[PDB]
Design brief:
Layout lengths: L32 H4 L7 H5 L8
The structure holds one RNA strand of 145 nucleotides.
PDB class: ribosome
Keywords: Large Subunit of Ribosome, A/P-tRNA, P/E-tRNA, Entamoeba histolytica, Ribosome
Entry title: Cryo- EM structure of large subunit (LSU) of 75S ribosome with A/P- & P/E- tRNAs from Entamoeba histolytica
Amino acid sequence: RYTTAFHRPATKNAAKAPKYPRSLKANRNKMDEFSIIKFPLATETALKKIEDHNTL
RNA sequence: AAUAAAAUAUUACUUUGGAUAGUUUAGUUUCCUGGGCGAUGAAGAACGCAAUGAAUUGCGAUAAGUGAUAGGAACAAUAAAAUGUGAAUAUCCAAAAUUUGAAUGCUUGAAAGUAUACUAAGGUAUAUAUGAUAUUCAAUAUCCA
């Protein structure tokens, strides 16, 4: 056979087919555009950059 | 010999201290009823959430609270709003339940992380041992055309 090693033969690998859902968690993303940004920084230092550097 | 500053003695009042007396939403012991946790993720730990909170308490991205069932007019430190078209309050109920932790895809020091499959992001599954069933195989191990 031209090889001195015996490995585990390849067998059929079926894909997972569960008979009932594992989790029923509702499909709602809790990290949306509203929750990501809490509020702008309204300090004097943060208000100075909004004219020149065009930054928020 | 002499004076009473100091020194000493008693009482009243004040002071320092917190004994004594009155008191208890705290304990101790005995007895009665149970002894009702967890891969459907426990106990424990961390972080976060109140209009003004640091602890504590309650809770989990629906946050000092949501729905439902009872309940019937409050809360309060200060403002506000909502409120008999139902406020406080209670519950062996329903929804929801961040990071961890037996911790279980892999790694974890105070580590930031990360692979595949299914259903760009998000969510599920994938540890080890193990019983049953199905299925793909390995061994001339026993026969055998």
